[PDB]
Amino acid sequence: NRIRILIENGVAERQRSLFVVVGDRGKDQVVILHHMLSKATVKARPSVLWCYKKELTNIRYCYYNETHKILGNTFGMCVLQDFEALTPNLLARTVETVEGGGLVVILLRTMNSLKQLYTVTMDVHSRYRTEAHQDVVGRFNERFILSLASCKKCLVIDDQLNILPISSHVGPSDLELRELKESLQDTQPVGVLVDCCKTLDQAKAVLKFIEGISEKTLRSTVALTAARGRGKSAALGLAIAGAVAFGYSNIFVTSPSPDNLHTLFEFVFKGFDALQYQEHLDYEIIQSLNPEFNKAVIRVNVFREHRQTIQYIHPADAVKLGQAELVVIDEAAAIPLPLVKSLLGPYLVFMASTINGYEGTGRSLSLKLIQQLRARTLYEVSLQESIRYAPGDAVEKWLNDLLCLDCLNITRCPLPEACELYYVNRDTLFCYHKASEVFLQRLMALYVASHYKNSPNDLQMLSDAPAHHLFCLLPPLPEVLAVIQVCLEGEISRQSILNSLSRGKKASGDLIPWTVSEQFQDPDFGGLSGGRVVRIAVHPDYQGMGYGSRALQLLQMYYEGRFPCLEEVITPRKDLPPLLLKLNERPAERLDYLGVSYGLTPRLLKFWKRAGFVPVYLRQTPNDLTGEHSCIMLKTLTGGWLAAFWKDFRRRFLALLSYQFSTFSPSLALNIIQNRNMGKPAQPALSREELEALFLPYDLKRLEMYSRNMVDYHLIMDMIPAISRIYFLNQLGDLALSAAQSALLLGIGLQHKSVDQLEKEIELPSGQLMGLFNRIIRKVVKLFNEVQEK
Amino acid sequence: DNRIRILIENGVAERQRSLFVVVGDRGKDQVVILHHMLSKATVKARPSVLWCYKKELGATNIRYCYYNETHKILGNTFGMCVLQDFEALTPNLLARTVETVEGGGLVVILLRTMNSLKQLYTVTMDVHSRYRTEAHQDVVGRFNERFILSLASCKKCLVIDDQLNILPISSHVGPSDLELRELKESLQDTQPVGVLVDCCKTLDQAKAVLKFIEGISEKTLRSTVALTAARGRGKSAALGLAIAGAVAFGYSNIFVTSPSPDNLHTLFEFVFKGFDALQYQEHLDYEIIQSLNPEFNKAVIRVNVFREHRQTIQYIHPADAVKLGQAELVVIDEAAAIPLPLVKSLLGPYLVFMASTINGYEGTGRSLSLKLIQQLRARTLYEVSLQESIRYAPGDAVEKWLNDLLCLDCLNITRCPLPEACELYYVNRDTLFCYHKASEVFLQRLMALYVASHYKNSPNDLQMLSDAPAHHLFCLLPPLPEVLAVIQVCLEGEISRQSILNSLSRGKKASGDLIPWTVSEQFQDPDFGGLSGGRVVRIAVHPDYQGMGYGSRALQLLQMYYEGRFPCLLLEEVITPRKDLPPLLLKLNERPAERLDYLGVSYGLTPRLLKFWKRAGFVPVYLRQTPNDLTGEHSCIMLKTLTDEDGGWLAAFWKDFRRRFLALLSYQFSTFSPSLALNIIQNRNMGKPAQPALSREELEALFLPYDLKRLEMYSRNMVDYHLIMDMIPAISRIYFLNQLGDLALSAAQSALLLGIGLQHKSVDQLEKEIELPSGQLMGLFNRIIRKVVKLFNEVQEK
Ligand SMILES: CC(C)(COP(=O)(O)OP(=O)(O)OC[C@H]1O[C@@H](n2cnc3c(N)ncnc32)[C@H](O)[C@@H]1OP(=O)(O)O)[C@@H](O)C(=O)NCCC(=O)NCCS
Ligand SMILES: CC(C)(COP(=O)(O)OP(=O)(O)OC[C@H]1O[C@@H](n2cnc3c(N)ncnc32)[C@H](O)[C@@H]1OP(=O)(O)O)[C@@H](O)C(=O)NCCC(=O)NCCS
Incomplete structure (x- = not known):
């Protein structure tokens, strides 16, 4: 009878439930649970979700392969079938889309014993098949089964609603949020966007973003940290909408792919609606209409008093960020550091990152380790409450512990x-x-x-x-x-x-x-x-x-x-x-x-x-x-x-x-070229036979002539790639070339880099670069004369 | 003696410049007499004399430049110019020192001390040390003779000696400011459209002013306007007023295109003047940013205005067109002096202001191709032009004399x-x-x-x-x-x-x-x-x-x-034309x-x-x-x-x-089109002495046996071309050196080989250069590989 109490407790605490059903039918239990959930909840249709691998009341039918499209949706419960298809990444993507008081149901098979440890028929197991080692032992299934007895909301039942001995052993947040909304109700585009928020933590970064936007100063790079499901795109979208209503004209959004966010622009329109904006004559949107995501919005044009635009830009694209007033960075932690530094400048910066879930990283992140150096502003905000369920959910803790999406460590010559x-x-x-x-x-x-x-x-x-x-x-x-x-x-x-x-x-x-x-x-x-x-x-x-x-x-x-080498549950292991x-x-x-x-x-x-x-x-x-x-x-x-x-x-x-590889730094390419573990068996020199075949006598005369009345180097630029090729092949003796000289030869010859381009990489004056390049020419000319027997 | 007085009086009463040529060693000392006469005739005191020297020679306000700093005086307007040191006087500064003289000027050339008007066969030009070819070392100097002979064709080109006596050669010799005034009065109480007009100086200037602003007032981003100047009618001033009007109209993205910041030197000056007419205070309403570089001088790059929102005016290069994604207004100065492909790339879905010069020493004929493709069309082709000068009244004799002498006229066009x-x-x-x-x-x-x-x-x-x-x-x-x-x-x-x-x-x-x-x-x-x-x-x-x-x-x-x-089967004489x-x-x-x-x-x-x-x-x-x-x-x-x-x-x-x-x-040359590089490579005027095939020794020395195996494997499988990308530059090098025989390569195949090998161009980059899909490019590239592999097989004794 404990099924009913668990359902009532979950629906009265906004906490999801987890039911594992073992049975071949799989049809006499889902409807019973659905009826119980409908009775226990205020609504009628929770919009349940059913997923399959390849083949089989608003129920939408989804497939495991096409899962990234469902990341932004919310359902009342989740149903998972065909257990020998799931992956650790997949399991963290379907349970996170369940509202409070969920009824996540997993149907493995119709076993009558511990037939899960050796019943591994996962699709991912076909890619571990190495010809050298064709024997694979399932181990993830054993941990998954044993993890259902460590949580208070992990009841395991059968098709006949029978409780197994393994599972037989087993509001306040919405207080300051409504007060804050009432206080900011009279406030002009400040509290209206706050009203669109769902969590008290959400309406603290938005207020911080609004306060920074309200002050007409271009020195602020406040960063926000999320935890994979607490609300980060919604806060960014409301902040962008508030900036538009504040008179900002140049707003840019940075993301590796248009498919990444899919929610930032959705809440921008929601924020515009809160501002009483009709998106047919006051503003217009532009879709990709190209193989970029599916229908991601790239540019949004707003014309109410002046002309303002919101344009999606690449993280590596910083040339168009000259007259930018506001920039929004999504998942800056996964964005390379040099790209982040180039993107930043003398304008408003909104940074978003994730430090939990199946994304991001920690361990004293270099994001808020080097930017904390300054006129610059270093405000910081964070979220710790989910928008789909009450904090401290048993299912979320069970998923995090099983999937090891926790324990930031840090704590320890x-x-x-x-x-x-x-x-x-x-x-x-x-x-x-x-x-x-x-x-x-x-x-x-x-x-x-x-x-x-x-x-x-x-x-x-x-x-x-x-x-x-x-x-x-x-x-x-x-x-x-x-x-x-x-x-x-x-x-x-x-x-x-x-x-x-x-x-x-x-x-x-x-x-x-x-x-x-x-x-x-x-x-x-x-x-x-x-x-x-x-x-x-x-x-x-x-x-x-x-x-x-x-x-x-x-x-x-x-x-x-x-x-030298001198029913009838069982205990986990002994x-x-x-x-x-x-x-x-x-x-x-x-x-x-x-x-x-x-x-x-x-x-x-x-x-x-x-x-x-x-x-x-x-x-x-x-x-x-x-x-x-x-x-x-x-x-x-x-x-x-x-x-x-x-x-x-x-x-x-x-x-x-x-x-x-021309974009490679000369130092990096030189390091790859030269190694100390391998010797040089190229002792024989170029010899006069190869010198005449590769270089014409007039070409040698031009090279010799250059070394005595040193002039513009464009006359002998046709010989540099050949000289560099035969030098790095260890056919030009030694020449006692230094590291700077070798790097200059590699960049000019092999990489076809101009002197001005190499000025930044070598970090040497042009006069010194000319001297080093000229010295190489004399060394090559002298060696060539020695090869040709004076 | 007397005739000087009427000419000065007529010039100052008609806003027409004069021209006096003084000959004699006693020159440069009688200029004060002309200066005193001009001061009484004119209603001013200091006419801002413009004395000049060759390179080091030496209540009145001369500006001392000799010849090098001519661009520094290119923007300022003077009331009297004194030209000295006839020695160099190349026909490029004479059009720069006289055009900067206001109406009723006293342009004076002191020439030299010829006692009988020695003409061309004396006083060699100080430019003649640039054509002294070692084979031909005999110059004539017909330019000096033509200049002297052209002094008797205009009514205001009197020639005087060192004693203020008219030479026998020269002895043979308002309504515009009416519609402009009424236009300013009619627009006295108008919003910034009507106050910026009052800053203009000519009616022609304030007719294109109410075409840019009229387009600015209509909040439509599909329109372009072309304006033509004549080197002295005023074009940067109109552009500056239009930019200032756009700023006051709420425009946030305004870009100015010019080859160099020093090209205009006045567009930003009138922008600040328009801002002053708009009651804009410096350091409180707007700020300016300079270049601070030895090149391009100390010009203005970016201007930021913060009255209600944030608006900027940024100078951009014609090549740089990526930053025009959110541009609202783009001004292109000297569009006719810019390459056509660059102009087309610069244009886009915004408001474009086109400025060009036709007459003077800027812009030439046969440039109507710019105003011939834009007429194809949703986009408009509003036309404006200028025909009245700024500093002097139209129809000036000195301007006509300078144009005729330097041939800055005769637009031709008129003629199987x-x-x-x-x-x-x-x-x-x-x-x-x-x-x-x-x-x-x-x-x-x-x-x-x-x-x-x-x-x-x-x-x-x-x-x-x-x-x-x-x-x-x-x-x-x-x-x-x-x-x-x-x-x-x-x-x-x-x-x-x-x-x-x-x-x-x-x-x-x-x-x-x-x-x-x-x-x-x-x-x-x-x-x-x-x-x-x-x-x-x-x-x-x-x-x-x-x-x-x-x-x-x-x-x-x-x-x-x-x-x-x-087969060959101070003169006292009349020069007169020579026949x-x-x-x-x-x-x-x-x-x-x-x-x-x-x-x-x-x-x-x-x-x-x-x-x-x-x-x-x-x-x-x-x-x-x-x-x-x-x-x-x-x-x-x-x-x-x-x-x-x-x-x-x-x-x-x-x-x-x-x-x-x-x-x-x-x-x-990597930026060159593959067709252009291929055309340069192959010529028909010279025969091709291609060496028949290549020896096996070269093949093994250039390509390792494993490298040949990799190339053969690719040709048999058509797998990934990245495995043999290290061999393509060498194969292309030996193919164009007439060492690979013929191979029956087509024009498209040859272009593909040249671009990938010699130019190191990626396949995606070559998609828009050959106008062939990547699927066909793979087939052509694969076919070349088989031909090279097959030919190499016959080289190594089958
Ligand atoms: C790479 C890693 C295992 C090195 O461990 P380590 O104990 O710090 O190595 P060492 O003590 O011998 O340090 C010597 C060299 O390691 C390199 N290196 C050191 N720390 C590094 C770091 N965080 N990241 C990248 N390279 C590093 C340095 O070049 C150093 O040479 P240097 O003294 O001249 O600067 C670890 O520091 C790390 O960064 N792991 C995450 C990245 C990774 O796993 N790369 C392997 C991909 S399979
Ligand atoms: C002589 C000139 C006008 C073109 O020659 P043309 O006698 O008019 O025409 P031709 O039949 O002899 O062929 C010339 C080719 O260049 C093309 N060309 C035509 N007009 C041209 C022009 N103003 N400028 C450059 N190339 C032109 C022609 O289309 C023709 O190509 P085609 O065979 O595909 O038709 C061109 O060389 C020229 O002088 N343009 C003015 C700029 C200049 O001074 N060029 C000389 C540089 S020293």
């Missing part, structure tokens, strides 16, 4: 040489239990506090992957200094790889083996044993102390071989080995090489190269967002094939520096 | 024969610049064709036309009724062998002989300077007679003429040729001009890497060998230029 590396048993890490879930939360806390976004699908990757291993660094459960996730790759095939080099298939894993072999046409690379470092992360409080390098070094020797195992008690796989795929970064490039990695691949097309190119590095473990791959990559990079 | 029946004649420069009758009209017609073919066209070319020692005139006549085409050719070459070596060892060139010096410096060939050549300085055809090959026939006839296919000269037009059979060895031309690169010059038979030899200021064009030098009058050296120069162009296509 030892010498790096005294640290020890310990292997983590994934079998005992995802079995809930006690003192192990906290370790999992701490590990995931380090996971998400290192990089923006960090989609929760990695949690399933962390548990259900067949060839993934976890290593942690511990001081001499103690605090985890660093965590490393390594994926085993290689030992695939030779005949299938040969067919895969043709118009074949790239399987579903082994990114490094399927990329290096494809790019270098070497079928023998896939037969080697390798390990890919998928994720590495040190604690934010001890970055730069050497813990990451020591952890990488310890992993290298462990893989080399320097650590067996399984301890959580942490010493490196001396676990045999190694005897890997032949170590690889890593990451996004190119001058600081990351230095760290990886110092570890002993050699670049092997660099993607030409920039990756979407963050403006970075994918880079693949390899390191031999003990050479033959690495040297050949390194030489081939260096030759390709020289010619590819003119297509898409 | 087959080109094959046309005849080419030579023009004697001695009898062309001697004034006379029926010859000055020909000079005006020739200058009419000269100006109406190219913008700017500074009058200094007239001195180069006459005073140059090695310049010749050629015209095409129908079978002097009318000049179908005119050609100006400069002779160059025969400099030295050791002088070139000394110049090459230092790198300084010299004055004159642009083509011989550039080719020698760029190719290190001292033997080129000893050859005989002729540089086509300018070729012009009638605008109504362009398109039927009149220029081509004139160029062809000139070629055979040079080849040798036309002892040969006929004005001489047949080509009565003038011996110079027997030149080659024909050259230096011009700015243009796809239509490139096709025309290449069709004539010219071969590119040089192309300037950096873009020239304005018009976005690169200087190009073409050469053509003269058969039967001299080709070995040209072939070597052409091969060297082609090799350099391939490597230079990635530095500054």
Whole structure:
């Protein structure tokens, strides 16, 4: 009979409920629950939502693949079917769209026992199938089932409304908000926009934004932080509408894609309606009418007293922000820092960010760490109350704990040489239990506090992957200094790889083996044993102390071989080995090489190269967002094939520096070009045979003539790309060229950069640049004369 | 003595400038007598004298500039100008120092101390040290003779000696401010439309003022207005008042377009004047922002006005059009002096104010193409113009004399024969610049064709036309009724062998002989300077007679003429015009040729001009890497060998230029269109000595065996082209070097290979240049890969 009490409690406290129904029918329980919810609620039709994977009272039928379109909607309850289709990211997107007093219902199957641990038939499990490791053990399902007995609103029933023993163990906010609205009722476009707010926290950033807009000063960059469902686009839209009514003419909205917000402009129209604006003769909107989002509004024109416009602009587009009066930045945390700095200027800035949910990051965010330096204004506001349910919802806490979307960590010197590396048993890490879930939360806390976004699908990757291993660094459960996730790759095939080099298939894993072999046409690379470092992360409080390098070094020797191995519910688990195992008690796989795929970064490039990695691949097309190119590095473990791959990559990079790598800084390109792990077997010089074939005798005369009556460099600009090409190929001896001279030669020759363009990058005067360039010419001319036997 | 008084009195009573020429060593001391007479005649005290000096010579308010700071006085208005140091006096500052004189002026030129009016054969021009070619070192100076002879054609050009005595040469010699006043009275009580009109000085100025503001008053963002000036009627003042009116009308986004901030120097001055008429207080209602840079001087860039909302007026470059997304009003100054593609990109869905100059030393004829496409249409084409001067009454004799002397008139336009029946004649420069009758009209017609073919066209070319020692005139006549085409050719070459070596060892060139010096410096060939050549300085055809090959026939006839296919089978005296000269037009059979060895031309690169010059038979030899200021064009030098009058050296120069162009296509020529670069690469006037195939040694040395395997794999699979993007620049380089055979590549395929390889252009960037979809571009690119792969297979013994 406890079903009724749970329904009444949820509807009387604005708290969602969670029901898990086990049964083949799945039709005699949804209607009963729907009737109970209708009786318990004031309304009649809660507009329930039903979702499927690919196939099967205002009910709309949605599909799992097409989910981003439903992010902005609100329903009374959620129904989930076809359990072997969900993903951790998907589970956090459908439950967040349920109003207070929800009736979220999940129908797994018609089991009669614990047939969920080994019944993993997820679509995502087909992409973990590696030919080397075809055995996959479901582990996420075990944690999901065991998490239903830790919350007070997670009742589990069957198709016959029978309570299982597992689940058998189990207003005030709207007080100051209405008072504030009444106080600001008489206020001219100040309180009317506040009336459109739904939460007291929402009508505090809006008031702050309105107060900043009211003061006609262009020095304010107040930033707002959200928590994925507490209201951030609505506050921004009301602020933009208030700015329009305040006489602002230049208002810009910054977002990576038009599809991101989809709500900011909706509330702008709502705010305009609160201002008694008719959007047919006082203002007009312009839609994309192009393959950008679906029907996102790009430009809005308002003509009441003067002409004002609201235009969507790209985060990288800052040229059109000259006469801008107000700029709105959405998800500035995920926006690259250099883009943020360029966007900011002497005008009003409205910043929005998320530090919770399945987005954003924390760990002393650099957003409010460097901007807190000044005439500039640094107001800050935040939200902590949801707009769809009462704070402290059991379902939200259950989702956050299961999905590890919490525990910002931060709360915590030892010498790096005294640290020890310990292997983590994934079998005992995802079995809930006690003192192990906290370790999992701490590990995931380090996971998400290192990089923006960090989609929760990695949690399933962390548990259900067949060839993934976890290593942690511990001081001499103690605090985890660093965590490393390594994926085993290689030992695939030779005949299938040969067919895969043709118009074949790239399987579903082994990114490094399927990329290096494809790019270098070497079928023998896939037969080697390798390990890919998928994720590495040190604690934010001890970055730069050497813990990451020591952890990488310890992993290298462990893989080399320097650590010889000398009804009727049930309890979660009692067996399984301890959580942490010493490196001396676990045999190694005897890997032949170590690889890593990451996004190119001058600081990351230095760290990886110092570890002993050699670049092997660099993607030409920039990756979407963050403006970075994918880079693949390899390191031999003990050479033959690495040297050949390194030489081939260096030759390709020289010619590819003119297509898409021209935007690279000369220092970054020079660092990629030169490595200390690989030697230079190019001792033989250019010789007179190649010098005459490559350069005409008149061309050599012009180069020699330039070195004695030094004149404008445009006469010999046709020879610079050839000279740079044959110098970086180690065919021009040594020439004792300095770092500045080498960078200048690379930029002018390979990148075809002008001297004025290189002025900012090199940060040297034009006279010094002329002298360095002229000195290179004399050195090349002198060496050429020596080659030609005087 | 007396006649000076009436002339001064008549000039001050009619708002017409005067002109006095004083001759004698006692000059510069009798100016006070004229100054005293002017002060009594006029109703002012200080006429703001404008004394000038050559470069260092030395209750009255002179402004002391000599010749360099002429742009500093370009905006100020004076009441009397004193011109000294006749030595330099190039025909470009005379139009700048007299136009800045108010009505009833006393423009005085002190000339020199000639005791018998020595005329042209004395007092050499201090510009003559710019045409002293080492081959031709004999200048005449016909400009001085023409200037002296033109002093007896106007009624207010009296010439006096050092003793205030009229020379025998010169001894032979209101209603406008009515409608403007009533217009101001009718608009006295009007809102800012009516108060800004009172700031105008002429009725013509306050007729375009009530066209910009009228368009401003109507809140419609689809309208453009074109205004034409004549260098002294007032155009920036009207633009400034219109901008000020727009600011008072609630406009928030106003942009001003000009090549340089110093071009106007008065638009913002009248904007502040209009703001003062609007009762706007500085530092309380608006603020200004300066450039604070050595270049562009201390002009005004951005002006911010905060009365009710925030409005700004920002100067923008013609190239910069991205920032015009939210523009409401855009003002384009000197639109006729801006490239057409830049003007079209600047225009958009807002209010456009177009300003241009037709007469004076700014803007020329045949510029109606700007006001010929905008008339296609939702958008309007309101037309305004000015015809009355600011400082002096219209119809001034001094203005007419200056215009006639500098040929700043005769807009031409007023005028079928087959080109094959046309005849080419030579023009004697001695009898062309001697004034006379029926010859000055020909000079005006020739200058009419000269100006109406190219913008700017500074009058200094007239001195180069006459005073140059090695310049010749050629015209095409129908079978002097009318000049179908005119050609100006400069002779160059025969400099030295050791002088070139000394110049090459230092790198300084010299004055004159642009083509011989550039080719020698760029190719290190001292033997080129000893050859005989002729540089086509300018070729012009009638605008109504362009398109039927009149220029081509004139160029062809000139070629055979040079080849040798036309065998020769204080005065106390009256100067009077000289008539002892040969006929004005001489047949080509009565003038011996110079027997030149080659024909050259230096011009700015243009796809239509490139096709025309290449069709004539010219071969590119040089192309300037950096873009020239304005018009976005690169200087190009073409050469053509003269058969039967001299080709070995040209072939070597052409091969060297082609090799350099391939490597230079990635530095500054990457912005060139693929069609334009391909046209420059391939020429029909020179045969192609392509080497048959390439040896296997070169293939292995340039391409690694694994690289060839990757290329073969791509051709068999058509997978991703990014895998072989490192080989495309090398493949393109060897294909255009005549080392890849023929390959039967089409024009589209060749353009695609050039853009991707040599120019390093992405496929998406080439979508709008080839006008072919990316799907077809992939097929063409893939087909080239198969052809290259197949050819490489045969190279390595199948
Ligand atoms: C990358 C990371 C594991 C390095 O850990 P670490 O213990 O600080 O490394 P070290 O102590 O050896 O520091 C030495 C070098 O690391 C580099 N580096 C250091 N901290 C970095 C940071 N937050 N971000 C990027 N690179 C960093 C630096 O270039 C440094 O060289 P330097 O002293 O000349 O400046 C960690 O700091 C980090 O930033 N993780 C998030 C980004 C990431 O995971 N990249 C890997 C992608 S697979
Ligand atoms: C001579 C000139 C007028 C064009 O030659 P033309 O005798 O009128 O016409 P032609 O039949 O000989 O062919 C010339 C080609 O250039 C084109 N062209 C035509 N008018 C032109 C013009 N004002 N300016 C530039 N190119 C022009 C023509 O269309 C023609 O191309 P087409 O074969 O596709 O029709 C052109 O060279 C010119 O002089 N323009 C004025 C600017 C100038 O001084 N140019 C010379 C630079 S030194």
